[PDB]
Amino acid sequence: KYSIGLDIGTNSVGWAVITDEYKVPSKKFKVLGNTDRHSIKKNLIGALLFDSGETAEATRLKRTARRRYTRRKNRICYLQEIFSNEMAKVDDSFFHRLERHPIFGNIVDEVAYHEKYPTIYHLRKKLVDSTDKADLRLIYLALAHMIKFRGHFLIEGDLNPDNSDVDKLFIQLVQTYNQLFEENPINASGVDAKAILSARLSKSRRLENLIAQLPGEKKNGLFGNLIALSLGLTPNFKSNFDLAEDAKLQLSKDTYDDDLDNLLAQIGDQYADLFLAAKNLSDAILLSDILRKAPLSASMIKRYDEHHQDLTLLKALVRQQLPEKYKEIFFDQSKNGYAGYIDGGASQEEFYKFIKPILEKMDGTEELLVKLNREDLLRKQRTFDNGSIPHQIHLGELHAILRRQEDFYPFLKDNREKIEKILTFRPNEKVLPKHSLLYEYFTVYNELTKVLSGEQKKAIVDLLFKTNRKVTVKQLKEDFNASLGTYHDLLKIIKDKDFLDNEENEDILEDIVLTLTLFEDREMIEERLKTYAHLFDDKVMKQLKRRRYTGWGRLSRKLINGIRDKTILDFLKRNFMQLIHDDSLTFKEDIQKAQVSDSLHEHIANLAGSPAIKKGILQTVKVVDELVKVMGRHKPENIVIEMAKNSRERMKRIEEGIKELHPVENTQLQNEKLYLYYLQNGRDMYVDQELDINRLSDYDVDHIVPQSFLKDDSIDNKVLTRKNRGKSDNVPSEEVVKKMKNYWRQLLNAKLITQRKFDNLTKLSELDKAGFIKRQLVETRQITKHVAQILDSRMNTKYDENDKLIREVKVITLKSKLVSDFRKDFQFYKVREINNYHHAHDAYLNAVVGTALIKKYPKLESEFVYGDYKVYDVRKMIAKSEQYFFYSNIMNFFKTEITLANGEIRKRPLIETNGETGEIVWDKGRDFATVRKVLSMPQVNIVKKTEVQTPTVAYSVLVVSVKELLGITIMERSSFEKNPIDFLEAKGKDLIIKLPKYSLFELENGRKRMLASAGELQKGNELALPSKYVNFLYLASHYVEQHKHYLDEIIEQISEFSKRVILADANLDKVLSAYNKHRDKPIREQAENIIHLFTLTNLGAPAAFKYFDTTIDRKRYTSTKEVLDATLIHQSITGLYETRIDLS
């Protein structure tokens, strides 16, 4: 019955709820405060504002080595379960043995394994290529290595030749680069990237070679650095972005993702896709190499073999021609020779610089020198050249091995899909040995829990189970399956009852029995036992080795003794199962959570993005959850999501242009008309009659491919005209005018117009239109796709009997431009500064436009809705003039009237419907009115998220001889969470009243405060400005004039607001005084400055601002005494559920 709209930014999340006719519901919510307000009516439209500070959430959103470790561990734990019962037949202690440390339980097998498989890739390759049956352990090892280091998931489908095409991905890179720099694109022309990047030369040389194809681009240029990143090098991006500190990037470096995030935080998340493109390019360069069995494993083996051939050669040479240097090069390890390279800490570059001269002086062989130049001489296994691998390549080998060994092992046939799913997927402890002292003890105690008093139990163990290997019932009566069989074993060897009986040693002995169970070979057992040798007599040590155990229990050590409350072992010494199943006791609670004992945060943490955007993404999810529960747990039909020098570049272009063939400074060039005046050298694009400044700009401007086919408001599609002379009919600028073109082409050589613009100017097929539609609907930005996926996953959980996913909720991703342009055409104007309502209004508009679009064109669903849907043939939807659309602009149906380029007019029906389903999508009479009404209403839930920090106060608490506010350091809080009263008393009781940062209080004529600190307050109010004034300000700023009397009204409004809530008398007087002086100023200049005046009224920290010549310094609310008698308001994330406190 409803849909959700979402606007997502780095410090805000806008949200709206919408019905079938685009109305925003009103709802009554209960108010849980002690105040005599019990319900409140609120509209389901709002915005959540958040800071980017040090908090628990923030840490949870960062990558951590431990989370990764646990992830991998779990995957392997799942792998081993599939192998368990079958591995039990081959090698019962195999998975317990695994992390030189031995894989196998006997030395013969271990040594043989390492001799046959010097690297894991040898094993992989052999398992991929051999038809012979293989030991299960080997199979496991290969599979486990594949699953452990599965690679990346950047590529969506089963690998195809486009994925390894250097040319195409290079083109992609340039494309994404060009979209981010409209003014100075790079031309792919006919560059043979493939040949330059794939060629076998130095990285630097390949870079330098590639840039030779790009004229006017420097090596240290952004693009050059990106290429250098894709090639394998470590470029520095600080010079490119004017960063204060160093920003070096290397794809091969383990910290790269984090480093990239670090960069993105500074320069903006808008640049993520640009670097992702570079990474993709890198992958292609590597992929084409391994492709031109198991190609990866083979390449690694080749690397290994080359390495050893070269090593032997080099050694021989150095023995022959430079014996003095031999010991140095191959053994010293503190030098930069081969020894330092392998077992020292030496760079490939340090090593190379070290041996470069030695090889040249030697003259034995230059082949090696060539290899050195290529940086392919003595490669190590522990590298990939600026790379993490596509998981698909590991998947291939996985499949191959399984297919190879499935005939010999049926359980592999049966579980194949399962095993694949582990790699592709997107208690903790291992059981004690069966003959462990602790386990044996547990069994006897648990069996003996009943036949009995706690003291007697201990007596009975100490008496019968201890003195006798097996205790029987007759014997018991004189004074039982479970036996302390190991306790007794170890007595005869150790011959010391205390050593056992003392509990402090148990943690040592567990290791001894474990060691005995782990290995079937005296040598190994000895080696491990050597560590505990000092306690033990040498006659004992020899005896210990012969003892061997071959079993595994069902329970872990921590389960038996690790868990709290007494332990299981202690409660036992009731009944174990009953102990597990009692809610009164803590274990049950421990276990149940312990199995699970965060995934969403972890998932968001591994996206490529700043901390802020990640926080945003996190908040959205919570907002959605709450809105769903607000709407009675019914799920929404649709969710629409959107993610919320240049002047100086323009100059460079112009200056570059005139160099081929009066002056203005930069700041002005933002005027499209002036910038266009300069790009064109004051010449009319369309009539060969020169353009001079003051009039013709005002005359007109024109789109090259009109608005009706698509909206391209970029200068790449725009030109300054006389707009009838050039355009003629709607088709691109008419044939008769192309006789003008020589002009344009000169402007091409000058780089004054781009190639595409010229192609369009010289130029409409069905095919173009088809491209044009997809262009306007498909969001390229990766992060939005990830957000979409996350939302879709949370919303759609149920599967039907056919195991197909049930999609209750469609997650729609909207291009920003559609809503921006929707705002343009129908005059729903935005002014960011008056309040924060625009974030909410954006969300509302997103949902409106999105839902309208799916209702109108459901066949295009595949282009902007998450999930897999049929990709219809666009050509069928395009029509001849009379028969969705002949005119390609998708937003056209909103308009009552489409103006063609020639000026001719196409009229549309008042009500727009879907012909196929007959559904009503848009009613121009009612619906636009509703939109305005929705934007016009003054009650919008704006919530500033409360934050707890982790000399900084985590939060302030209200204390009650007197009422006072008290800050809490992070250091103080822990013991405070332990020992409240003694803190509170040491400093100087009903109420625990932690006031998180930004806590909201209200007082007087609806005047609220936010608690920044126990020392300062922030304004707590949103100034609701009537829409008329908003539109007037937008229109006044963007140069009718009969509406000059509204300025005074706006200022009167601001002043009313300020005197009511801001309470900045001295500041306001100056503000008001300033307006009196500058009535003379023109309207534009007049309007722009009243905008700045809004920072006086803005919600948040007080700040300073300049009105014309005058400057108003900020005022701080340094007294927190107001808050103490005020009414606190605890806000939900949506702000819909409130709790209102006021002791007074």
Instruction: Annotate 514-550 with DSSP letters as a single string.
Output: HHHHH-S-HHHHHHHHGGGTTTS-HHHHHHHHH----
| 930, 21 Cβ separation under 8 angstroms | yes
Provide the experimental method for this PDB entry: X-ray
| Token pair of 714 as six digits | 């970029």
Alpha helices in 428-469 (DSSP H): 437-448, 454-460
Measured at the alpha carbon of residue 914, what is the angle toward residues 911 and 920, in degrees to the nearest 5?
Answer: 45
Contact yes or no for 580/591 (Cβ under 8 A): yes
Instruction: Return the number of other C-beta atoms located less than 10 Å from residue 119's C-beta.
Output: 14
Whether the Cβ atoms of residue 215 and residue 226 lie closer than 8 Å to each other: no
Judged by DSSP in three states, 321 sits in helix
Q: Which of 644, 703, 645 is nearest to 672 (CA)?
A: 703
Give the separation between CA 677 and CA 661, rounded to whole angstroms. 15
Encoding tokens for residue 852? 């309208």
The dihedral sign for the CA sequence 305, 310, 313, 318:
negative
The angle subtended at Cα 754 by Cα 751 and Cα 756, nearest 5°, is 155
Count of beta carbons in the 10 Å neighbourhood of residue 395:
18
Residue by residue, DSSP assigns 201-259 as: S-HHHHHHHHHTTSTT--TTSHHHHHHHHHHT---B-HHHHT-SS--B--TTSTTHHHH
Terminal Cα-to-Cα distance of the chain (whole angstroms): 44
Give yes or no: residues 363 and 405 share one domain: no
SS3 293: coil
Residue 370: name the closest of 210, 195, 202, 209 by CA: 202
Indicate the SS3 state at residue 641: strand
Longest dimension (CA), the chain: 124
∠ CA 761-762-764, nearest 5°, is 85
Residues 6+ positions from 822 with CB-CB distance below 8 Å? 828, 845, 849, 891, 894
**Which are the contacts of 587, defined by CB distance < 8 A and separation ≥ 6?**
563, 565, 568, 579, 580
Amino acid at 428: N
Q: Which of 181, 91, 179 is nearest to 140 (CA)?
A: 91
Q: How far apart are CA 65 and CA 843, in angstroms?
A: 37
Do 366 and 490 belong together in one domain?
no
Token representation of residue 995: 């006031």
393 CB-contact burial (10 Å; exposed 0-12 / middle 13-18 / buried 19+): buried
**Distance between CA 370 and CA 1037 in Å, rounded?**
65
* Nearest one of 967, 1077, 970 to 1015, comparing CA atoms: 967
Do residues 308 and 364 both lie within one domain? yes
Are the C-beta atoms of residues 219 and 239 closer than 8 Å to each other?
Answer: no
CA torsion 560-561-566-572 (nearest 10°) is 40
User: Is beta strand 905-907 parallel, antiparallel or unpaired with respect to 897-899?
Assistant: antiparallel
Is residue 1124 classed exposed, middle or buried when 0-12, 13-18 and 19+ CB atoms within 10 A define those classes?
middle
Q: What is the DSSP string of 112-142?
A: HHHHH-SSHHHHHHHHHH--S---HHHHHHH
1045 annotated to bind ligand: no
Place of tokens 């050039």: 726
- How far apart, in whole angstroms, are the C-alpha atoms of residue 179 and residue 185? 8
Query: What is the per-residue DSSP string for 1029-1063?
Result: HHHHHHHHHT---TTTHHHHHHHHHHHHHIIIII-
* Annotated binding residue 642: yes
Q: How far apart are alpha carbons 370 and 361 in whole angstroms? A: 15
**H-helix or E-strand spanning residue 812:** strand 810-813
Q: From CA 532, how far away is CA 505, in angstroms rounded? A: 11
CA distance 731 to 400: 56
What pairing do the DSSP bridges indicate for beta strands 26-30 and 999-1003?
A: unpaired
Query: Quick one: the chain helix, strand, coil %, rounded to 5?
Result: 50, 10, 35
Torsions phi, psi for 1141 (to 5 deg): -105, 140
Beta-bridged to residue 1130, according to DSSP, are 1139
Judge whether 124 and 144 are in contact, CB under 8 Å: no
Verify that 332 and 344 share a domain, yes or no: yes
Of 67, 76, 116, which is closest to residue 95 (Cα–Cα)? 76
The number of C-alpha atoms within 13 Å of 351 and in the hemisphere containing its C-beta is 24
The whole-angstrom separation of Cα 628 and Cα 635 is 6
Instruction: Tally Cβ neighbours within 10 Å of residue 496.
Output: 15
Number of CB atoms found within 10 A of residue 130's CB: 12
Q: Would you say 1011 and 995 are in contact if contact means Cβ atoms under 8 Å apart? A: yes
Pull the structure tokens for residue 402: 């399984």
Which residue in this structure is represented by tokens 């600190």? 1013
Q: Are 999 and 946 in contact (CB under 8 A)?
A: yes
Q: Do 280 and 169 meet the contact criterion of CB atoms below 8 Å apart?
A: yes
Give dist(CA 705, CA 234) in Å, integer. 42
Spatial separation of the C-alpha atoms in residues 10 and 30, rounded to whole Å: 31
CA 1006/CA 986 separation, integer angstroms? 38
Give the Å distances, CA to CA, from 624 to 5, 14, 381, 759, 770.
Answer: 10, 11, 47, 46, 35
Strands (E), 798-845: 810-813
152 labelled as ligand-binding? Answer: no
Q: Which of 771, 682, 764 is nearest to 720 (CA)?
A: 682
Q: Compute CA distances 354 → 205, 303, 344, whole Å.
A: 21, 21, 14
**In whole angstroms, how far apart are CA 623 and each of 644, 840, 1105, 1133?**
16, 13, 33, 6
- Please report, for residues 135, 965, 971, 994, the alpha-carbon distance to residue 959 in angstroms, rounded to integers and kept in the order given: 70, 6, 19, 10
5 and 86, same domain (yes or no): no
- List, by residue number, the catalytic residues: 7, 703
Residue 588 host element (H or E): helix 587-596
Cα-flanking dihedrals φ and ψ of residue 710, to 5°? -160, 160
Cα 258 to Cα 251, 379, 793, 938, distances in angstroms: 11, 26, 26, 42
Ramachandran sector of residue 469 (left: φ over 0; alpha: ψ -120 to 50; beta: rest) = alpha
Residues 92 and 98: their CA atoms lie apart, in Å, by 12
* Rounded Cα–Cα distance for residues 243 and 266 (Å): 8
* Cross-strand bridge partners of residue 638: 3, 810
The data reach a resolution, in angstroms, of: 2.6
Is the separation of the CB atoms in 764 and 734 below 8 Å? Answer: no
7 pairs with which residues across the strands? 14, 642
Q: Are residues 761 and 614 in the same domain?
A: no
Distance of alpha carbon 29 from alpha carbon 295, whole angstroms? 63
Are residues 1063 and 1105 both part of a single domain? Answer: yes
Domain span at residue 314? 293-385
C-alpha span between 1070 and 1111 (Å, rounded): 9
Using an 8 Å Cβ cutoff, are 602 and 67 in contact? Answer: yes
Q: Which residue, among 598, 602, 609, has the nearest Cα to 785 in the 3D structure? A: 609
Phi first, then psi, for residue 242 (nearest 5°) are: 60, 40
> Based on the domain organization, do 416 and 335 belong to the same domain?
no
Instruction: Report CA dihedral (922, 924, 926, 927) to the nearest 10 degrees.
Output: 50
Residue 260 sits in the same domain as residue 408: no
How many other β-carbons are positioned within 10 Å of the β-carbon of residue 1003? 16
Q: How far apart are CA 184 and CA 1110, in angstroms?
A: 39
Which residues are bridge partners to 1117 per DSSP? Answer: 1017
Give yes or no: residues 679 and 821 share one domain. Answer: no
DSSP summary character for residue 1002: E
Residue 1078 annotated as binding site: yes
Report the alpha-carbon distance of residue 124 to residue 296 in Å, rounded. 10
Angle at Cα 471 formed by Cα 462 and Cα 431, nearest 5°? 75
Pairing type for strands 1110-1112 and 1127-1131 reads unpaired
Transcribe 733-794 into DSSP letters.
S-TTGGGGHHHHHHHHHTTSS-HHHHHHHH---HHHHHHHHHHHH----HHHHHHHHHHHHH
The residues that bridge with 1140 in the sheet, in sequence order, are 1129
Q: Among positive and negative, which fits the CA dihedral 231, 234, 235, 237?
A: positive
Would you state the structure tokens that stand for residue 231, as one six-digit string? 């090639």
> In sequence order, which residues have a C-beta less than 8 Å from that of residue 70 and are 6 or more positions away?
none
The C-alpha torsion from 990 through 992 and 995 to 1001, rounded to 10°, is -30
Phi (first) and psi of residue 835, to 5 degrees: -160, -175
Both tokens of 621, joined, read 């999810």
Burial of 422 (0-12, 13-18, 19+ CB in 10 A): buried
Q: Please, are residues 1104 and 1113 in contact by the beta-carbon 8 Å criterion?
A: yes
The interaxial angle of helices 391-405 and 136-148, nearest 10 deg, is 170
Query: Is the separation of the CB atoms in 761 and 705 below 8 Å?
Result: no
Alpha helices in 233-347 (DSSP H): 238-241, 256-267, 272-291, 295-321, 324-331, 338-342
258 annotated as ligand-binding: no
Cα–Cα dist 1131/1010, whole Å = 12
CB 710 within 8 A of CB 748: no
Distances (CA, A) of 455 to 452, 483, 572: 9, 20, 11
Going by C-alpha positions, the residue among 887, 890, 809, 878 that lies closest to residue 849 is 890
Distance in angstroms (rounded) separating the CA atoms of residues 119 and 1082 = 78
Three-state secondary structure call for residue 452: coil
- CA–CA distance from 366 to each of 318, 330, 377, 609 (Å)? 14, 20, 11, 46
Whether residue 591 is found in the same domain as residue 605: no
Token pair in block for residue 365: 């062989």
**Those residues with Cβ within 8 angstroms of residue 722's Cβ, 6 or more apart along the chain or in another chain:** 684, 686, 687, 689, 696, 699, 700
Given a contact cutoff of 8 angstroms between Cβ atoms, the answer to whether 205 and 199 are in contact is no
Buried b (16+ CB within 10 A) or exposed e, 349-365: ebbbebbeebbeebebe
Going by DSSP bridges, is the β-strand pair 810-813/638-643 parallel, antiparallel, or unpaired?
parallel
| Radius of gyration, CA atoms only, the chain | 37
Q: Which of 257, 247, 251 is nearest to 284 (CA)?
A: 251
In 3-state terms, what secondary structure has residue 296? helix
Same domain membership, residue 945 and residue 805 = yes
Angle at 937 between CA 933 and CA 942, to 5 degrees: 135
Query: How many whole angstroms separate alpha carbon 854 and alpha carbon 24?
Result: 19
| Tokens 């390890």, located at residue | 333
Contacts of 709 (CB under 8 A, 6+ apart): 764, 768, 769, 772, 887, 888, 889
Cα 67 to Cα 26: distance, rounded to the nearest angstrom: 43
